[PDB]
Amino acid sequence: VEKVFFVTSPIYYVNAAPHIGHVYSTLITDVIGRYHRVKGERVFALTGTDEHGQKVAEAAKQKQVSPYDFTTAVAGEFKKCFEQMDYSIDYFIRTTNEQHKAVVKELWTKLEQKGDIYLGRYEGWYSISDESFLTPQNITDGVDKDGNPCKVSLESGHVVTWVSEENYMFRLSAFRERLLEWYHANPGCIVPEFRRREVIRAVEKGLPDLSVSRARATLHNWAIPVPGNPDHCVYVWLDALTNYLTGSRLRVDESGKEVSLVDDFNELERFPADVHVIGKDILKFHAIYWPAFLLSAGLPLPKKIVAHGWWTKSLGNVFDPVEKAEEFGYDALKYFLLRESGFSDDGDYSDKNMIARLNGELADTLGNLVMRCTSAKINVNGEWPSPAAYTEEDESLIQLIKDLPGTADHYYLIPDIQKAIIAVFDVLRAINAYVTDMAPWKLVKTDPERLRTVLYITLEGVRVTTLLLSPILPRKSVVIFDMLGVPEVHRKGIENFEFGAVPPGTRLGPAVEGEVLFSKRST
Numbered sequence: 001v002e003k004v005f006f007v008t009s010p011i012y013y014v015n016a017a018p019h020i021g022h023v024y025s026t027l028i029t030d031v032i033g034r035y036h037r038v039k040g041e042r043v044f045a046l047t048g049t050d051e052h053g054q055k056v057a058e059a060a061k062q063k064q065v066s067p068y069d070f071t072t073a074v075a076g077e078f079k080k081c082f083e084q085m086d087y088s089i090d091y092f093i094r095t096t097n098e099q100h101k102a103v104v105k106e107l108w109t110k111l112e113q114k115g116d117i118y119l120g121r122y123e124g125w126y127s128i129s130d131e132s133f134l135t136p137q138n139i140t141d142g143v144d145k146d147g148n149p150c151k152v153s154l155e156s157g158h159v160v161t162w163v164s165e166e167n168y169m170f171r172l173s174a175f176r177e178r179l180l181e182w183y184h185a186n187p188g189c190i191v192p193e194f195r196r197r198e199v200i201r202a203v204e205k206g207l208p209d210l211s212v213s214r215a216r217a218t219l220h221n222w223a224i225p226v227p228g229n230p231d232h233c234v235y236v237w238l239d240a241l242t243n244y245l246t247g248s249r250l251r252v253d254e255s256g257k258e259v260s261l262v263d264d265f266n267e268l269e270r271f272p273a274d275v276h277v278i279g280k281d282i283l284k285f286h287a288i289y290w291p292a293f294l295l296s297a298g299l300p301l302p303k304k305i306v307a308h309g310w311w312t313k314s315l316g317n318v319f320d321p322v323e324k325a326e327e328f329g330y331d332a333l334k335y336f337l338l339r340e341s342g343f344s345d346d347g348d349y350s351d352k353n354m355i356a357r358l359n360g361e362l363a364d365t366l367g368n369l370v371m372r373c374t375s376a377k378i379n380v381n382g383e384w385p386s387p388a389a390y391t392e393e394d395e396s397l398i399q400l401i402k403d404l405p406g407t408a409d410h411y412y413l414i415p416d417i418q419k420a421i422i423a424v425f426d427v428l429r430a431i432n433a434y435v436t437d438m439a440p441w442k443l444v445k446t447d448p449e450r451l452r453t454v455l456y457i458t459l460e461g462v463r464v465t466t467l468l469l470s471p472i473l474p475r476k477s478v479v480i481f482d483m484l485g486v487p488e489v490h491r492k493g494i495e496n497f498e499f500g501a502v503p504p505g506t507r508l509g510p511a512v513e514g515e516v517l518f519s520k521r522s523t
């Protein structure tokens with residue numbers, strides 16, 4: 001069925017300033033959203049801040065400022081960061097928002113009515129920094145700020161404390177069979193695949209019930225009250241995960257402010273998420289807890305959870321994304337982050353490798369090709385020529401260009417943005433090779449008829465590759481299209497994935513004295 005394509009980032013803890021992890025997660029979310037908008041679909045892309053809980057309230061206390069003031073200020077820092085990064089997110093949600101709290105209370109009440117919440121106790125380990133319950137098998141020995149013997153989390157390395165409280169408990173154990181059914185019936189619902197296998201193994205072993213409330217004193221009263229019991233607060237993660245539901249129900253105006261909360265999610269056609277973008281650090285919450293809550297409430301499950309390789313959320317290793325983007329370019333940094341790494345940590349993020357990709361891929365492969373086909377020396381009439389008859393070599397390149405949208409489409413839908421980029425650049429390399437073989441600079445004098453054909457194919461290859469790279473290079477793609485003289489109507493829509501969508505006779509855009517797309521930088 002036709003619906004609004006709904007893509008989300010995690011909502012980030014506001015204990016600290018925005019950093020590369022947050023920017024990376026929201027970048028992926030943004031790229032996916034952009035691709036679906038270029039495809040001509042309706043899109044709602046969501047990001048925001050996770051503002052309640054012990055961790056935030058303790059950070060507020062450290063800075064000697066109220067939780068209200070602290071969260072509002074740090075949220076403002078996140079908004080500013082994402083504006084500076086030139087994202088195109090449709091809404092920024094904050095869990096302190098009154099409409100979100102109403103949704104949390106609805107969902108809580110639904111779970112309780114279904115018989116899935118009971119009053120019990122949690123006695124066990126807890127990482128405040130991850131807001132995560134841990135079993136004894138997931139802890140080990142380590143050290144704290146004092147350098148004194150303490151327990152730490154195996155998953156994250158943060159300090160764990162023993163908790164013994166009477167707590168509202170969600171009957172997670174009862175959802176094991178249904179979760180396993182879901183994973184097996186939808187074998188692309190978690191990506192990448194090895195992370196799907198991890199989740200399945202964990203659920204097969206068995207699920208304990210889950211504490212979904214805490215004593216109010218423990219959280220410094222900085223959380224959502226349990227409906228019908230003011231002494232208890234809603235677990236920060238049930239609160240947090242519900243943001244996706246709240247977002248799916250907010251009507252938003254032209255300026256991006258929330259103006260209304262609808263009763264029925266179906267009214268806005270967003271829920272459930274088509275893609276939840278997350279870091280590997282929060283996989284269990286999204287692939288186990290979240291769907292169990294939705295199953296309890298009788299709500300539809302998300303289509304895909306994609307978990308990337310970075311562990312999101314003084315030592316002398318600073319990476320400021322705004323600083324690096326001011327140095328190397330915003331689109332270039334975005335390209336680098338999405339190209340350098342797939343679902344690993346193992347990528348190299350040095351200035352050396354950044355420069356190597358800028359120079360070799362963006363400047364030498366893409367930019368060079370754009371200048372060649374728009375150059376006055378080669379394109380003497382400053383237009384899209386009408387092609388003459390095609391050779392076999394012409395047809396081999398044309399075939400690559402025609403196959404590219406379908407290939408790139410599949411990669412974007414996985415989603416696997418690294419492979420989408422690689423596929424496009426494989427075609428760009430082939431076009432370059434073709435240009436080198438045809439030597440159009442010699443044809444200008446020798447064989448003008450032949451040049452028409454070569455020039456046309458080259459222009460069309462640059463257009464199609466650029467269209468498919470426009471989610472990755474949103475600003476530079478616009479520059480490229482302006483140079484090519486591609487009318488606005490042809491810059492989006494699946495109709496324009498087709499070879500030959502821009503007619504011969506189309507005039508190129510004006511030139512500038514010494515304009516460069518991507519300036520190469522010192523080795």
Ligand code: MET
Nearest residue numbers: 010011012013050240241
């Ligand atoms: C429902 S997404 C919550 C993510 C969490 N606040 C984090 O920063 O890891």
